[PDB]
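Researcher: Please generate the 3D structure of the following complex. Treat every line as part of one assembly.
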Amino acid sequence: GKAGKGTGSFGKRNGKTHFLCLRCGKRSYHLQKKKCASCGYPSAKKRRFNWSVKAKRRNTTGTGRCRYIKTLRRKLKNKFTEGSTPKPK
Amino acid sequence: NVKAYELRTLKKKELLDKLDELKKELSGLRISKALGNSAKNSKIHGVRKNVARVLTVYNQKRKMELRQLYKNKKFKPYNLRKKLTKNKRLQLSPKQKAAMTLRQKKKVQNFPQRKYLVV
Amino acid sequence: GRVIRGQRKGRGSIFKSHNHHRKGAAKLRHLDYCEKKGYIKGLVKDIIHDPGRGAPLAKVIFKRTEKYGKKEELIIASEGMFTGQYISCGTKAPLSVGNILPI
Amino acid sequence: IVKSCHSKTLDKYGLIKYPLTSEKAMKKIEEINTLVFMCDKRANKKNIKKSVKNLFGIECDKVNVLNTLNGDKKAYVRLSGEHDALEVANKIG
Amino acid sequence: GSIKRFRLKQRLGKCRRQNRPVPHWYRLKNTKRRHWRRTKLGL
RNA sequence: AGCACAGUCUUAACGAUGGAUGUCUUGGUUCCUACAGCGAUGAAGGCCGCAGCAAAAUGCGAUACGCAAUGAAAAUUGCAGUGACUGAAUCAUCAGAAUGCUGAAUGUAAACUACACCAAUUCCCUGGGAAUAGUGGUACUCCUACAGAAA
RNA sequence: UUUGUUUUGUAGCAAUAGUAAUUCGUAAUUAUCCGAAGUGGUAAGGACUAUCCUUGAAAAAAGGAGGGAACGGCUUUGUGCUUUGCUACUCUUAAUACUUGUAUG
RNA sequence: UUGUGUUGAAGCGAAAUACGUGAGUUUUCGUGGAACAUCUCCCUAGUGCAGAUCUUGGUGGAAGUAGCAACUAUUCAAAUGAGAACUUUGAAGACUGAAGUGGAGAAGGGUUUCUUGUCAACUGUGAUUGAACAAGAGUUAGCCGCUCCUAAGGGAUAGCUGAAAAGUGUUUAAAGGGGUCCCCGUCUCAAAAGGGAAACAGGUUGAUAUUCCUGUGCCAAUAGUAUUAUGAGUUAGAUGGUAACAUAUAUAUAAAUGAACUCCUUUACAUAGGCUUUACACUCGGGGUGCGUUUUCUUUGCACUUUACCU
RNA sequence: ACGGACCAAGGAGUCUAGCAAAUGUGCAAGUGUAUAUGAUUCUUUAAACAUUUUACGCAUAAUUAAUG
RNA sequence: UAAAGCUAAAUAUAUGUAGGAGACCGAUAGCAAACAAGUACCGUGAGGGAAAGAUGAAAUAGUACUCAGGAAUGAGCAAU
RNA sequence: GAUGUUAGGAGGGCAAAUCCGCCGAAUUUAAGCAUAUAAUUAAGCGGAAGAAAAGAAAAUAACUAUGAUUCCUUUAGUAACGGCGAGUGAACAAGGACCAGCUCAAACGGUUAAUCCUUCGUUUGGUGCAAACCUUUCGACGGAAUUGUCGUU
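Model: Done. Output below.
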């Protein structure tokens, strides 16, 4: 009819199925089944797949800040004992 | 503008008092900035850095005096004890790795590797 | 071919029973020493319609024997039983319409 | 785990950011004896009441709060009739 | 809608904040700009 | 002051449009070499913030485009402003301090800044003196030791 | 301490507010805001009648009842109980003071 | 190997009494402004384009052409402005016709809202307009909602399967609460239209209003001790009516003993049909007030004449 | 009959393994020094240089299912 | 001399990090990305995924002044 | 056995190029196709290290014999497998890199668990400015252990 296959039905496009997914922050959290389509947030694992190199590489490590590992880097070459400070003037 | 070495000799009381009055002056500066007044807007950076400095000195004093409290005692809190890598923490001690049974200890002691030459 | 309609029934997705307004399962009293060696009389407090089935059910109130209180039972009503009637259950219950006896 | 640094919970300096001086805020002071403040989002009615009490010698009658789109909380603070809202506004600017 | 969650409202405020132009004094030395009607933020 | 018909097509000169060509190159690619785990001591990832004027990127975490310390060491600047005549301005190093909400996420939840229970908690002086509704803890499985109940 | 007869009040809210007017420096004064009815449009309620091989949610929360466990106060003997001497006491709302971590939202 | 370059290299445009048969080579002028060649011999390859409905980019004739056609309809004068058919004001003619381009909301959007500027692009004609651009500002709740409950149902725990991933969810659960030894008992999420503690009126801004102001209320909570005060009851819990039942009016109907253990009620429910009551709506007549018609007629036509929640 | 409106730039028998033929080169009943080692070589050099007088491939002999 | 167990080296490394190179590519090439690139943007979602380098030695030489225009702009006897 | 917000601890997730287990195709080739091939591959699940895994003969040979594992040259496109079609395909010896061997069980020890752990103390000296760190052996306590720790081979 008037809500036919195309333009008519597109008028009823409200009520999204997906939302923000607190873990990824990406709009893929399926609201009805409470599960992220991008990372599977309720599950403990990350929902990666080897058949999508693109998807792997656009969210692997190093894509973000690396808030801690980047600090711990170069301590292998310094080899300072924890709690040590440079000798004062 | 205060440097980090001259206040290193203050007690915690006046250290906190200096922090408090410095925060109050920063708050006044921010109030003026929010108002139309804008002449003093450039001292906000200096006051903020002074707050950072006094906080650094106070926290370092507190941490050192807390370590003095758990000197030895073998049961320091987790933050006080070492923060190596997790697997380094779980690694066997060098003594444990070098530990040997009496049988192989006496074998090694009685027949060690020897240095020698040839004609 | 594809899965036929009869096959899809066992999946139990839309072929589950429409049971929202059912009043409960129709069961007699659980076997008890009273029922084994005597009569226990329950008062049929009400008779109601269970939307799934055609036979009316009977809300019957028994008095608990192990503790003070009243227990509620839903028993498929027999033709001719009426609210306010006492039905006896057990071996020694008299043979009359509505009573529960061993065969 | 023991903590050595002094607490970083939000005190008055940081709970109350600055007064609001927009046209609406400025008008409210003379008419309805109220002051408009900008606060950090983590504040609440009790936090704001205690903060203004111990930052300025003012006693609160009631606080109304809203969350702006700029990431802060706007607080309409009605002063009691014991002390008017204009001389305190003059005192702080 | 008129009724919103706190996180959604803060996200809307952040997206509005990121829509401002480059400061003029900085231009003495932007492209990630959106219009509410052309490109929906979908979030 | 005057004269060319118009259009269509061809040629040359000069220009428009366009961005080829040449020349550039703080980029890529491949090989060789060397080292190599991060996480309940809370990771990777995601949000949210942070500058005097500040959107992005970069950096950082309520001490928030940076603190302290160490080496260098006079600039830093768009304006404003800050600096010695060197713990000061700026780099570099980075061991100390600090490191928001989350996330394995782990008190219960989650399109909630929702709701529990247990210790009240934190700070200052050398037993007091203050301030705080704030702060910690509480997942599941398992190991070692312990406890009092069970046959 | 009862029954008949008047006045008052839009029953309090309430006119101080609104509304429509007339004036006055340009913010104030003044007057009105009351006598009756009809139609049945919408909504709700009530008391009913009828229909079903269709009988048309639950829980949080709240209430009623059945039952009858416990029993004054001041002092005292003896090992909560028996006891001696005296009687003005138990609940309920509100307010105040102190303690309690800061004792409304 | 041996050369060319700021006394201008590569490239490019036009060329040449030029050479070759030809791919080409070499020169001139102009432009260009920094590199270029090696034919001495050889090495190497991502090495030669007219096409592949080839790929990417750019540009044509079509062509100032098709077209700018639903929604009946515009006109006069003035203001602003560089500029006005489509900005504003006044007048007129009309439309929408309470099943409305009128008021409120939901989903969705996310600042489009308001004010002040403003016109590079957009607003398929214009444009001084604007949902465009710029700078500021704007969203106030114990009573409106969420938050709480449970539904269709989702997740999870115990198990049990499975290499795990996962599948099911009490299938041998020793699984929180209560009084004071016992009783009850998987957890958690899922409704902004279901259930549900409690608010009305007037006013106020440029933009918010059951949220602000004024006034008047209502709901929930209010720990322990001690004082007062209010009421009852008692020399261990009141009283009327035959009855249906009623009674505490203190600022305020607050108190009418009551455990364990139980049994109910409310919450709490379909559809159709008419009858009836009330409120709101509409309408008629009278009184008052203001306005309008008034060549003629008109004791006239129109507007106002109001009263919330709570007690 | 199909593709081609126009122009620029890009655009397609290559690389490796293995065999043969052809031709050039070295040595010749021998040929190839494999992996690896040494050595005042260590920008180039990841290449060049070297190999205490039955390693291995191919060839030097064929034929047979095969003992041979 | 099975049905028990440990063990370095020679070995591999389309990952991360840090170095050094090349008869490699030279902005339609080379990674998708020489740049604010897994960015903008598209899809409910899984995912898809660009375009975009060059003034000059020096802008611490980025166009002053005049005229004409409402302005954009244009012109100059003016100007780096 | 339970139960414990008893004391002290561990696991969980990310990351994968190399590495270790499982699970597991089809495109393709055969000029069709079904065994075969693709391939003990891709996808899927799980688990580690700077390497992993393998490893100290229940091995090979048949010789004048060799002597853990791994890797390189080769054996060798060979023996063999196969609608004996398409295709597939090792091992021993030989030359090298490297080179490393060991311990439980079982045996033996009872005029004596000779073992081990937890907690609390003592000093033996040292590098650090400090923070911290390395050595140290005398205990005492509470346990575990004869349903078997330790010593010998």
